Design a protein around this ligand. Structure first.
Ligand SMILES: Cc1cc2nc3c(=O)[nH]c(=O)nc-3n(C[C@H](O)[C@H](O)[C@H](O)COP(=O)(O)OP(=O)(O)OC[C@H]3O[C@@H](n4cnc5c(N)ncnc54)[C@H](O)[C@@H]3O)c2cc1C
Ligand SMILES: NC(=O)c1ccc[n+]([C@@H]2O[C@H](COP(=O)([O-])OP(=O)(O)OC[C@H]3O[C@@H](n4cnc5c(N)ncnc54)[C@H](OP(=O)(O)O)[C@@H]3O)[C@@H](O)[C@H]2O)c1
Length: 531
């Protein structure tokens, strides 16, 4: 295509966030355009084409709600949508609303500066494009910059993959000795798929993550047709929860119940499948003794599923509270370790020294491999922004304002960078809820804000320093009543060497955050200085 020279709003990213922003700003009567590195729309579901890639929120929850047409027409097929289906869904939405005409593909934003003279952003690309825009909306994702973990890497003679940059043609592992590094949810999803083709699968686990069974199933078309009659009502229920989904909020303490009640209640969640067990009790994420009561139950289920108790014990998560890393939904992951051709390489015990040209050496031995898959995650939440040279007032780099951790007012803007907005990022609920609920709310609040600026004749919107300071403090304070900050997770930035350890997300629940945001808007955007 080709980016316009001037535009009311420039949006970066064509995944869920950017698509909705483009749609809604058009509907608001604004000129808007999108720059996207990828060859086409989808964002994470464009990039994460590893086999077994699948959402952990139910298909009926994980979808747009802005368009009645879309809710009535689209049919989901399974409890949880695999990546191809979600990508087909996003394509369907792009077509329906003709979004591709406002998007330049194959183009990476590399810099952006705020010009105080004009109250506009100047944005440059890796193609030479230079765009002038009143407002800049960063919809560049939360888990969109692959993290490659390092000594022997470029030496590897075989094929090298990262799950977050998977080839667009399916990949044949038939006959191969294959290694996976990462047992986060990417590796836990990709591994049983690989184990079916490979002669030998080596799973390189470091800290074992908690996974519970997904128990995927066909989605009954009769249930779907029924749900469609009440869909807006149903999504509205989802928006009035902490997590953006129909999870039941267990009112009891995990400490108050008897042993027999605990086992029974949790057994029920384990048979049902899904992530809801995370809210079986109100204090699982607040109190270390409540947490441990749940964690031990799960731990015993793991020892149950694997026949060799030596391998079994190696898969049991230790050292950190259940649910403080992302909780993972597994499909046949544990059962896979009972196969003859799958070997758990415990690297807490025998750390990876180096990659060789033949494979991977740990302290203990060398494993030869034809293919190596990195399921090693992402430079989360800040990674995409930090890959861009972004400059605010007095030429402050964002990289510098945020060097000790991200600093925002509501997660939506940062002081000294006016007219710039982050969609579903640090300082807001983000990945702690159903992201379609997080993303829709932010797109609507930001684009309402833009509309309100234009109608009132204003051209400059900035967060007030002391409000940002109060916001950061409040985020840290509420985070500090949970067990989240106790643990090294991507939420904490802890998977990136050198990255400052700070819990980056709002933990007070989607619903409360949204109230705070509405109260702000209704007061003429309190905490913002508009001129
Ligand atoms: C594999 C995977 C599975 C997921 N499963 C769940 C799920 O179970 N539940 C859920 O709630 N969330 C899920 N997510 C989280 C996911 O981030 C959100 O649900 C949502 O897809 C993100 O939407 P987005 O548009 O904000 O970001 P993205 O989908 O990441 O889109 C951002 C786009 O911007 C592009 N971009 C970045 N920087 C630049 C730049 N410099 N110039 C041009 N383009 C740029 C990126 O290439 C990307 O295409 C999962 C994430 C991953 C990685
Ligand atoms: N179905 C889904 O919902 C789904 C699927 C995929 C992704 N996601 C989203 O994206 C996030 C990322 O998931 P992910 O699995 O890609 O990444 P991750 O959760 O960031 O897991 C990275 C994995 O790689 C390991 N690792 C990283 N660096 C390493 C190193 N230098 N040496 C050895 N091991 C290393 C980590 O070990 P340690 O744990 O010990 O650090 C962990 O096993 C998820 O938590 C979730 O938010 C969701």
């Amino acid at each position: 295509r080709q980016p316009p020279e001037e535009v009311d709003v420039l949006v970066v990213g064509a995944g869920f966030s950017g698509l909705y922003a483009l749609y809604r700003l058009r509907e608001l009567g604004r000129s808007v355009h999108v720059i996207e590195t990828a060859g086409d729309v989808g964002g994470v579901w464009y990039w994460n084409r590893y086999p077994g890639a699948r959402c952990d929120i139910e298909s009926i929850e994980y979808c747009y709600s802005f368009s009645e047409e879309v809710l009535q027409e689209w049919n989901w097929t399974e409890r949880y949508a695999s990546q191809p289906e979600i990508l087909r869904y996003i394509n369907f939405v792009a077509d329906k609303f003709d979004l591709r005409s406002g998007i330049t593909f194959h183009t990476t934003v590399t810099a952006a500066a705020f010009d105080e003279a004009t109250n506009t952003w100047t944005v440059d690309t890796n193609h030479g494009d230079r765009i002038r825009a009143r407002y800049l909306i960063m919809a560049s994702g939360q888990l969109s910059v692959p993290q490659l973990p390092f000594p022997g890497l470029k030496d590897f003679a075989g094929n090298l993959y990262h799950t977050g940059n998977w080839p667009h043609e399916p990949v044949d592992f038939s006959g191969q000795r294959v290694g996976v590094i990462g047992t986060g949810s990417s590796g836990i999803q990709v591994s049983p798929q690989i184990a079916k083709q490979a002669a030998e699968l080596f799973v390189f686990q470091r800290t074992p993550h908690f996974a519970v069974p997904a128990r995927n199933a066909p989605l009954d078309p009769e249930f779907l047709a029924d749900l469609k009659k009440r869909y807006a009502e149903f999504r509205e229920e989802s928006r009035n929860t902490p997590g953006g989904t129909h999870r039941y909020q267990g009112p009891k303490s995990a400490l108050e119940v008897s042993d027999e009640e605990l086992v029974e209640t949790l057994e029920r969640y384990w048979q049902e499948g899904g992530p809801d067990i995370l809210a079986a009790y109100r204090d699982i994420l607040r109190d270390r003794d409540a947490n441990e009561r749940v964690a031990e139950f799960i731990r015993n289920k793991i020892r149950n599923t694997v026949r060799d108790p030596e391998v079994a014990e190696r898969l049991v998560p230790k050292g950190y509270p259940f649910g403080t890393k992302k909780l993972i939904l597994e499909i046949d992951y544990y059962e896979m370790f009972n196969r003859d051709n799958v070997h758990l390489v415990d690297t807490l015990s025998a750390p990876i020294e180096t990659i060789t040209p033949r494979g991977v050496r740990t302290s203990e031995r060398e494993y030869e491999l034809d293919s190596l898959v990195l399921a090693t995650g992402f430079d989360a939440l800040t990674g995409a922004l930090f890959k861009i040279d972004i400059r605010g007032v007095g030429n402050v780099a964002l990289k510098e304002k945020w060097a000790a951790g991200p600093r925002t007012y509501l997660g939506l803007s940062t002081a000294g960078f006016p007219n710039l907005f982050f969609i579903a990022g640090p300082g807001s609920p983000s990945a702690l809820s159903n992201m379609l609920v997080s993303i829709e709310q932010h797109v609507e609040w930001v684009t309402d804000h833009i509309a309100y600026m234009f109608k009132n004749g204003l051209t400059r919107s900035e967060a007030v320093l002391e409000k940002e300071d109060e916001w950061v403090e409040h985020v840290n304070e509420i985070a500090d009543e949970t067990l989240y900050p106790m643990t090294a997770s991507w939420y904490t930035g802890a998977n990136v060497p050198g990255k400052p350890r700070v819990f980056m997300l709002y933990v007070g629940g989607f619903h409360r955050y949204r109230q705070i945001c509405d109260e702000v808007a209704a007061k003429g955007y309190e905490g913002f200085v508009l001129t």
